[PDB]
């Protein structure tokens, strides 16, 4: 079996996009395998993936982003398994940054704010953010809040007092483009009064 998944990042570096694919099952030593993609491309007809460590991927500006394209696993010449994908559906956004919580003794709440480089982009602009936070007492028990802007607020009396909280955010394409979740933004730790 040669199952594999792939995620694209539009305008990742400047105006160039990336495409990263991986093999589902962790195995096969220094494989004679290599990846390729055709269709939905411009200047060229097909492009050759590079191969770094254990992952394969490319960085072009050549993605048309209209209609599907053929991504096939190949050895020398022998084509094995292919897969017609529409890169605008497998978009993994860049993680949010500048996360920060501010406490206002005036209104008795916690203002969560963060930034995303997707706001200044041309394609994947609209995102759907997911703020998650757990308590020191608990471990794998997080509570998510699905926002749509870069500012959230949590009222004092909504979570333990004298409690220390860990908070983080991630993003996802929420509009025309579809895809997976972004990595998590580094965590912020603050203590409750």
């Amino acid at each position: 079996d040669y199952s594999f998944s792939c995620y694209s990042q539009l305008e990742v570096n400047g105006s160039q996009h990336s495409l990263t694919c991986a093999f589902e099952d962790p195995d096969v030593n220094t494989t004679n395998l290599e990846f390729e993609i055709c269709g939905a491309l411009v200047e060229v007809k097909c492009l050759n993936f590079r191969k770094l460590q254990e992952i394969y991927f490319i960085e072009t500006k050549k993605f048309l982003l209209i209609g599907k394209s053929n991504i096939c696993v190949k050895v020398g010449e022998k084509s094995l398994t292919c897969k017609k994908i529409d890169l605008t559906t497998i978009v993994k956004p860049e993680a949010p940054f500048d996360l920060s919580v501010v406490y206002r003794e005036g209104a008795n709440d916690f203002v969560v704010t963060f930034n995303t480089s997707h706001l200044q982009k041309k394609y994947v602009k609209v995102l759907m953010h997911d703020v998650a936070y757990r308590q020191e007492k608990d471990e794998n028990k997080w509570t998510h809040v699905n926002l749509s802007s870069t500012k959230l607020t949590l009222l004092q009396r909504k979570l333990q007092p004298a409690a220390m909280y860990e908070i983080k955010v991630r993003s996802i394409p929420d509009h025309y483009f579809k895809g997976f979740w972004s990595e998590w933004s580094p965590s912020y730790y603050f203590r409750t009064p």
Partner: protein, 118 residues
């Protein structure tokens, strides 16, 4: 998923191209080129306009350069080419250097598109 593919993707390249040309204006303004006279975006089936206007943008493609400019040109063309069959109507040259033209050409390509969509 019918016309969304335009503004969300295709229109992206069209605007980026027009922006690089914001500095163009009065100097050459209206020259009334044969093309806009001959072919026109008439409500009476205007997809035949873009099917031509698409091939025409293909005349600004130099020695297959890798600039963002050429690439957007490709995208707008091929993009409009392919966005035509999937969107209904369908079927199956020298060089141009004039940017005053290229601009107007993109204006129209922009207009007609949403004209057929909206």
């Amino acid at each position: 998923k019918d016309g969304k593919q335009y503004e969300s993707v295709l229109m992206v390249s069209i605007d980026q191209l027009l922006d690089s040309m914001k500095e163009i204006g009065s100097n050459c303004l209206n020259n009334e080129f044969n093309f806009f006279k001959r072919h026109i975006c008439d409500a009476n089936k205007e997809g035949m306009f873009l099917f031509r206007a698409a091939r025409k943008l293909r005349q600004f493609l130099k020695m297959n350069s890798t600039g963002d400019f050429d690439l957007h040109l490709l995208k707008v063309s091929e993009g409009t080419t392919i966005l035509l069959n999937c969107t209904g109507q369908v079927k199956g040259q020298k060089k141009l250097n004039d940017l005053c033209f290229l601009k107007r050409l993109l204006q129209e390509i922009k207009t007609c598109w949403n004209k057929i969509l909206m």
